[PDB]
mmCIF file of C-alpha atoms and ligand atoms in Angstrom:
data_model
loop_
_atom_site.group_PDB
_atom_site.id
_atom_site.type_symbol
_atom_site.label_atom_id
_atom_site.label_comp_id
_atom_site.label_asym_id
_atom_site.label_seq_id
_atom_site.Cartn_x
_atom_site.Cartn_y
_atom_site.Cartn_z
ATOM 1 C CA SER A 1 7.410 -6.156 40.272
ATOM 2 C CA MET A 2 5.310 -9.326 39.949
ATOM 3 C CA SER A 3 7.654 -12.288 40.569
ATOM 4 C CA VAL A 4 10.631 -9.878 40.708
ATOM 5 C CA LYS A 5 11.749 -9.348 44.298
ATOM 6 C CA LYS A 6 14.497 -7.114 45.648
ATOM 7 C CA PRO A 7 16.753 -9.017 48.054
ATOM 8 C CA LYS A 8 14.898 -9.071 51.374
ATOM 9 C CA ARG A 9 16.697 -7.181 54.135
ATOM 10 C CA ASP A 10 16.585 -9.180 57.394
ATOM 11 C CA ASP A 11 14.038 -7.475 59.663
ATOM 12 C CA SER A 12 13.532 -10.194 62.291
ATOM 13 C CA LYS A 13 15.483 -8.298 64.969
ATOM 14 C CA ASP A 14 13.960 -4.858 64.348
ATOM 15 C CA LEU A 15 11.398 -5.106 67.150
ATOM 16 C CA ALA A 16 14.124 -5.859 69.717
ATOM 17 C CA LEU A 17 16.547 -3.244 68.343
ATOM 18 C CA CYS A 18 13.941 -0.463 68.359
ATOM 19 C CA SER A 19 13.087 -1.481 71.919
ATOM 20 C CA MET A 20 16.759 -1.206 72.901
ATOM 21 C CA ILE A 21 17.049 2.224 71.272
ATOM 22 C CA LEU A 22 13.884 3.435 72.982
ATOM 23 C CA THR A 23 15.260 2.185 76.299
ATOM 24 C CA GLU A 24 18.388 4.309 75.830
ATOM 25 C CA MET A 25 16.126 7.249 74.910
ATOM 26 C CA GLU A 26 14.062 6.788 78.060
ATOM 27 C CA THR A 27 17.139 6.598 80.294
ATOM 28 C CA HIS A 28 18.880 9.666 78.819
ATOM 29 C CA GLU A 29 19.057 12.463 81.415
ATOM 30 C CA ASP A 30 17.427 14.927 78.989
ATOM 31 C CA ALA A 31 14.484 12.588 78.310
ATOM 32 C CA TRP A 32 12.318 14.113 81.054
ATOM 33 C CA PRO A 33 10.241 16.415 78.868
ATOM 34 C CA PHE A 34 9.314 13.478 76.606
ATOM 35 C CA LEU A 35 8.590 10.579 78.978
ATOM 36 C CA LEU A 36 4.857 11.271 79.318
ATOM 37 C CA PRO A 37 2.228 12.965 77.146
ATOM 38 C CA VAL A 38 2.101 16.749 77.415
ATOM 39 C CA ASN A 39 -0.945 17.494 79.581
ATOM 40 C CA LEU A 40 -3.484 18.897 77.110
ATOM 41 C CA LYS A 41 -5.749 20.205 79.858
ATOM 42 C CA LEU A 42 -3.020 22.219 81.594
ATOM 43 C CA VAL A 43 -0.718 23.477 78.838
ATOM 44 C CA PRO A 44 -2.122 26.487 76.946
ATOM 45 C CA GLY A 45 -2.122 26.232 73.155
ATOM 46 C CA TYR A 46 -0.716 22.708 72.949
ATOM 47 C CA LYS A 47 -3.889 20.821 71.985
ATOM 48 C CA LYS A 48 -4.775 23.321 69.232
ATOM 49 C CA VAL A 49 -1.259 23.840 67.894
ATOM 50 C CA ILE A 50 0.182 20.307 68.041
ATOM 51 C CA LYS A 51 -1.980 18.170 65.792
ATOM 52 C CA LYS A 52 -0.265 14.864 66.565
ATOM 53 C CA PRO A 53 1.182 14.763 70.097
ATOM 54 C CA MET A 54 3.698 11.980 70.724
ATOM 55 C CA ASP A 55 5.960 10.914 73.624
ATOM 56 C CA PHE A 56 8.202 7.997 74.651
ATOM 57 C CA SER A 57 5.605 6.223 76.811
ATOM 58 C CA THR A 58 3.128 6.289 73.938
ATOM 59 C CA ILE A 59 5.790 5.001 71.587
ATOM 60 C CA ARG A 60 6.648 2.285 74.114
ATOM 61 C CA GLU A 61 2.983 1.230 74.329
ATOM 62 C CA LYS A 62 2.643 1.137 70.530
ATOM 63 C CA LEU A 63 5.845 -0.889 70.161
ATOM 64 C CA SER A 64 4.804 -3.414 72.818
ATOM 65 C CA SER A 65 1.405 -3.943 71.194
ATOM 66 C CA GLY A 66 2.465 -4.407 67.579
ATOM 67 C CA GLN A 67 1.293 -1.019 66.357
ATOM 68 C CA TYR A 68 4.396 -0.264 64.257
ATOM 69 C CA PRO A 69 4.237 -2.138 60.952
ATOM 70 C CA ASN A 70 7.959 -1.508 60.338
ATOM 71 C CA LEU A 71 11.235 0.257 61.193
ATOM 72 C CA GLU A 72 10.312 3.492 59.527
ATOM 73 C CA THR A 73 6.957 4.028 61.219
ATOM 74 C CA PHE A 74 8.746 3.730 64.537
ATOM 75 C CA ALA A 75 11.354 6.321 63.496
ATOM 76 C CA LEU A 76 8.585 8.642 62.276
ATOM 77 C CA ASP A 77 6.989 8.691 65.734
ATOM 78 C CA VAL A 78 10.326 9.329 67.464
ATOM 79 C CA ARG A 79 11.040 12.226 65.110
ATOM 80 C CA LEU A 80 7.495 13.494 65.656
ATOM 81 C CA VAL A 81 8.320 13.923 69.348
ATOM 82 C CA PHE A 82 11.187 16.263 68.486
ATOM 83 C CA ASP A 83 9.371 18.028 65.643
ATOM 84 C CA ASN A 84 6.560 18.837 68.056
ATOM 85 C CA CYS A 85 9.081 20.054 70.612
ATOM 86 C CA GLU A 86 10.623 22.447 68.070
ATOM 87 C CA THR A 87 7.218 23.759 67.055
ATOM 88 C CA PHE A 88 6.205 24.655 70.602
ATOM 89 C CA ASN A 89 9.451 25.550 72.368
ATOM 90 C CA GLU A 90 12.100 28.183 71.689
ATOM 91 C CA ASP A 91 15.520 26.763 70.800
ATOM 92 C CA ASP A 92 17.005 28.718 73.729
ATOM 93 C CA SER A 93 14.977 27.034 76.462
ATOM 94 C CA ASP A 94 15.754 23.988 78.600
ATOM 95 C CA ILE A 95 13.096 21.915 76.839
ATOM 96 C CA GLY A 96 14.121 23.271 73.444
ATOM 97 C CA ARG A 97 17.743 22.260 74.027
ATOM 98 C CA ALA A 98 16.603 18.883 75.370
ATOM 99 C CA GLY A 99 14.769 18.204 72.119
ATOM 100 C CA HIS A 100 17.812 19.004 69.989
ATOM 101 C CA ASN A 101 20.085 16.861 72.174
ATOM 102 C CA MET A 102 17.654 13.888 72.101
ATOM 103 C CA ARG A 103 17.146 14.092 68.340
ATOM 104 C CA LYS A 104 20.904 14.066 67.795
ATOM 105 C CA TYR A 105 21.167 11.182 70.232
ATOM 106 C CA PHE A 106 18.461 9.203 68.422
ATOM 107 C CA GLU A 107 19.685 9.723 64.889
ATOM 108 C CA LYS A 108 23.139 8.412 65.795
ATOM 109 C CA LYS A 109 21.786 5.275 67.453
ATOM 110 C CA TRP A 110 19.521 4.902 64.413
ATOM 111 C CA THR A 111 22.365 5.214 61.909
ATOM 112 C CA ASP A 112 24.694 2.974 63.916
ATOM 113 C CA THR A 113 22.040 0.316 64.484
ATOM 114 C CA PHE A 114 20.520 0.012 61.000
ATOM 115 C CA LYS A 115 22.938 1.670 58.562
ATOM 116 C CA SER B 1 3.852 -5.913 62.421
ATOM 117 C CA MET B 2 7.554 -5.216 63.029
ATOM 118 C CA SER B 3 9.327 -8.608 63.140
ATOM 119 C CA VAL B 4 5.929 -10.368 62.927
ATOM 120 C CA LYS B 5 5.360 -11.746 59.434
ATOM 121 C CA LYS B 6 2.343 -13.564 58.036
ATOM 122 C CA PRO B 7 3.380 -16.743 56.215
ATOM 123 C CA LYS B 8 4.542 -15.620 52.772
ATOM 124 C CA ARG B 9 2.375 -16.943 49.945
ATOM 125 C CA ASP B 10 4.568 -18.155 47.056
ATOM 126 C CA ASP B 11 4.317 -15.542 44.290
ATOM 127 C CA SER B 12 7.259 -16.583 42.094
ATOM 128 C CA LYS B 13 5.015 -18.026 39.364
ATOM 129 C CA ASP B 14 2.471 -15.189 39.263
ATOM 130 C CA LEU B 15 4.048 -13.420 36.286
ATOM 131 C CA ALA B 16 3.867 -16.595 34.171
ATOM 132 C CA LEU B 17 0.356 -17.531 35.352
ATOM 133 C CA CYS B 18 -1.078 -14.077 34.618
ATOM 134 C CA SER B 19 0.566 -14.279 31.199
ATOM 135 C CA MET B 20 -1.101 -17.648 30.573
ATOM 136 C CA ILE B 21 -4.493 -16.292 31.651
ATOM 137 C CA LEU B 22 -4.099 -13.225 29.449
ATOM 138 C CA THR B 23 -3.193 -15.497 26.538
ATOM 139 C CA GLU B 24 -6.457 -17.410 26.982
ATOM 140 C CA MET B 25 -8.275 -14.054 27.177
ATOM 141 C CA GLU B 26 -6.676 -12.876 23.945
ATOM 142 C CA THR B 27 -7.546 -16.092 22.103
ATOM 143 C CA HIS B 28 -11.194 -16.215 23.240
ATOM 144 C CA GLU B 29 -13.527 -15.686 20.260
ATOM 145 C CA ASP B 30 -15.333 -12.847 22.076
ATOM 146 C CA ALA B 31 -12.070 -11.003 22.812
ATOM 147 C CA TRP B 32 -12.266 -8.881 19.649
ATOM 148 C CA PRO B 33 -13.715 -5.741 21.208
ATOM 149 C CA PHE B 34 -10.911 -5.702 23.804
ATOM 150 C CA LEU B 35 -7.743 -6.575 21.866
ATOM 151 C CA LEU B 36 -6.788 -2.980 21.033
ATOM 152 C CA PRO B 37 -7.457 0.417 22.619
ATOM 153 C CA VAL B 38 -10.798 1.985 21.735
ATOM 154 C CA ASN B 39 -9.985 4.686 19.172
ATOM 155 C CA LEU B 40 -10.459 7.934 21.107
ATOM 156 C CA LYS B 41 -10.418 10.058 17.964
ATOM 157 C CA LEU B 42 -13.189 8.109 16.221
ATOM 158 C CA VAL B 43 -15.566 6.967 18.964
ATOM 159 C CA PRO B 44 -17.904 9.731 20.191
ATOM 160 C CA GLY B 45 -18.068 10.239 23.953
ATOM 161 C CA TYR B 46 -15.485 7.607 24.868
ATOM 162 C CA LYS B 47 -12.565 9.884 25.787
ATOM 163 C CA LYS B 48 -14.745 12.116 27.995
ATOM 164 C CA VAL B 49 -16.809 9.357 29.591
ATOM 165 C CA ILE B 50 -14.196 6.633 30.164
ATOM 166 C CA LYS B 51 -11.602 8.103 32.490
ATOM 167 C CA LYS B 52 -9.242 5.121 32.440
ATOM 168 C CA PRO B 53 -9.383 3.205 29.140
ATOM 169 C CA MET B 54 -7.842 -0.272 29.233
ATOM 170 C CA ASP B 55 -7.514 -3.204 26.794
ATOM 171 C CA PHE B 56 -5.698 -6.551 26.487
ATOM 172 C CA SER B 57 -2.793 -5.251 24.381
ATOM 173 C CA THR B 58 -2.126 -2.523 26.934
ATOM 174 C CA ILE B 59 -2.309 -5.063 29.725
ATOM 175 C CA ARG B 60 0.055 -7.319 27.770
ATOM 176 C CA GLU B 61 2.549 -4.457 27.347
ATOM 177 C CA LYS B 62 2.379 -3.576 31.056
ATOM 178 C CA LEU B 63 2.847 -7.214 32.076
ATOM 179 C CA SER B 64 5.838 -7.698 29.765
ATOM 180 C CA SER B 65 7.555 -4.573 31.090
ATOM 181 C CA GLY B 66 7.159 -5.135 34.824
ATOM 182 C CA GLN B 67 4.453 -2.538 35.357
ATOM 183 C CA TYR B 68 2.267 -4.708 37.620
ATOM 184 C CA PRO B 69 3.684 -4.775 41.149
ATOM 185 C CA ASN B 70 1.509 -7.793 42.036
ATOM 186 C CA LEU B 71 -1.355 -10.194 41.255
ATOM 187 C CA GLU B 72 -4.071 -7.812 42.275
ATOM 188 C CA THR B 73 -2.990 -4.838 40.179
ATOM 189 C CA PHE B 74 -3.117 -7.107 37.156
ATOM 190 C CA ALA B 75 -6.648 -8.273 38.033
ATOM 191 C CA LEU B 76 -7.727 -4.654 38.570
ATOM 192 C CA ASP B 77 -6.751 -3.748 35.002
ATOM 193 C CA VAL B 78 -8.529 -6.791 33.549
ATOM 194 C CA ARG B 79 -11.689 -5.912 35.468
ATOM 195 C CA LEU B 80 -11.311 -2.292 34.360
ATOM 196 C CA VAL B 81 -11.657 -3.461 30.753
ATOM 197 C CA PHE B 82 -15.050 -4.990 31.521
ATOM 198 C CA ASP B 83 -16.190 -2.193 33.840
ATOM 199 C CA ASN B 84 -15.506 0.282 31.049
ATOM 200 C CA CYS B 85 -17.384 -1.927 28.607
ATOM 201 C CA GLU B 86 -20.451 -1.966 30.878
ATOM 202 C CA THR B 87 -20.333 1.794 31.309
ATOM 203 C CA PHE B 88 -20.355 2.495 27.578
ATOM 204 C CA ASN B 89 -22.325 -0.370 26.039
ATOM 205 C CA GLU B 90 -25.873 -1.614 26.559
ATOM 206 C CA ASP B 91 -26.097 -5.126 28.015
ATOM 207 C CA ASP B 92 -28.176 -6.166 24.981
ATOM 208 C CA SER B 93 -25.529 -5.437 22.358
ATOM 209 C CA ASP B 94 -22.874 -7.687 20.829
ATOM 210 C CA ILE B 95 -20.082 -5.821 22.614
ATOM 211 C CA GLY B 96 -22.086 -5.667 25.835
ATOM 212 C CA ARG B 97 -22.611 -9.436 25.802
ATOM 213 C CA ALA B 98 -18.945 -9.956 24.908
ATOM 214 C CA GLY B 99 -17.910 -8.045 28.017
ATOM 215 C CA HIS B 100 -20.115 -10.138 30.295
ATOM 216 C CA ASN B 101 -18.891 -13.391 28.731
ATOM 217 C CA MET B 102 -15.203 -12.358 29.027
ATOM 218 C CA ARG B 103 -15.569 -11.214 32.633
ATOM 219 C CA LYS B 104 -17.159 -14.534 33.563
ATOM 220 C CA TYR B 105 -14.406 -16.305 31.662
ATOM 221 C CA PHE B 106 -11.684 -14.350 33.475
ATOM 222 C CA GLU B 107 -13.029 -14.684 36.986
ATOM 223 C CA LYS B 108 -13.179 -18.471 36.667
ATOM 224 C CA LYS B 109 -9.610 -18.756 35.403
ATOM 225 C CA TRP B 110 -8.651 -16.366 38.211
ATOM 226 C CA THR B 111 -10.372 -18.413 40.914
ATOM 227 C CA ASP B 112 -9.101 -21.727 39.546
ATOM 228 C CA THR B 113 -5.540 -20.470 39.140
ATOM 229 C CA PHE B 114 -4.997 -18.657 42.450
ATOM 230 C CA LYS B 115 -7.752 -19.796 44.828
HETATM 231 C C1 5K3 C 1 7.719 18.208 75.161
HETATM 232 O O1 5K3 C 1 7.339 19.006 76.298
HETATM 233 C C2 5K3 C 1 6.697 20.220 75.980
HETATM 234 O O2 5K3 C 1 6.724 20.621 74.828
HETATM 235 C C3 5K3 C 1 6.512 21.215 77.124
HETATM 236 C C4 5K3 C 1 5.664 22.441 76.703
HETATM 237 C C5 5K3 C 1 5.631 23.372 77.904
HETATM 238 C C6 5K3 C 1 6.487 24.454 77.962
HETATM 239 C C7 5K3 C 1 6.460 25.380 79.169
HETATM 240 C C8 5K3 C 1 5.593 25.142 80.198
HETATM 241 O O3 5K3 C 1 5.569 26.003 81.320
HETATM 242 C C9 5K3 C 1 4.644 23.936 80.132
HETATM 243 C C10 5K3 C 1 4.664 23.100 79.049
HETATM 244 C C1 5K3 C 2 -14.678 -2.156 24.297
HETATM 245 O O1 5K3 C 2 -15.124 -1.679 23.013
HETATM 246 C C2 5K3 C 2 -15.989 -0.568 23.063
HETATM 247 O O2 5K3 C 2 -16.482 -0.248 24.133
HETATM 248 C C3 5K3 C 2 -16.693 -0.190 21.761
HETATM 249 C C4 5K3 C 2 -17.494 1.129 21.890
HETATM 250 C C5 5K3 C 2 -18.197 1.334 20.558
HETATM 251 C C6 5K3 C 2 -19.525 0.979 20.416
HETATM 252 C C7 5K3 C 2 -20.225 1.176 19.080
HETATM 253 C C8 5K3 C 2 -19.544 1.701 18.018
HETATM 254 O O3 5K3 C 2 -20.195 1.883 16.777
HETATM 255 C C9 5K3 C 2 -18.067 2.093 18.178
HETATM 256 C C10 5K3 C 2 -17.432 1.917 19.377
#
């Protein structure tokens, strides 16, 4: 509360560490469905169904331009990518499996890096 | 943003300074309408009309028990006292004038102490 602070966790390296993690995401062989925005003009249903589209290039732009106020907002956007993927794609599809693989991949790097 | 911090204003004395200011509020001769909660069982209209009743003793209790997360939440409750007073009392009444005097009194101590 007022004049009562929790010990401040060191966050000075978060920007660099999230960038590193995103780089490993981008270079994963199953990253291809998530590198660019889904094309809203060509994919039926997607614009109406997926209220908040997200992808790695958009996350990269936001990270590079100071649009994540903290660790958690970055993680929320990464998870949003995979939540969207689950909403729109069957689990037993190439893209569906990609999403599951990438989410697993992310959450490990996230745990290892910050926990 | 992430790993980009504004210079941190020193807030370690805020709890003590707000306590000092509240003490001067409490000891002001026109503080008497605001020292204790308005009696909701005896004052017609007050419970229905005034959605968030506030008074100095309640503010004192909240301050002493770590219920203000920061400077501003404390100031919001003090102002709430006088906003309520304006809502319920005519300007040309003893209590009405008291409220105006106390608000002026507070805002000066607030400006002088933290600005
Ligand atoms: C993250 O990528 C997408 O969700 C792809 C959605 C999609 C599925 C099948 C198609 O033929 C076209 C687009
Ligand atoms: C902050 O004190 C109050 O607003 C008092 C409201 C009130 C006005 C006249 C009365 O006869 C009783 C209560």
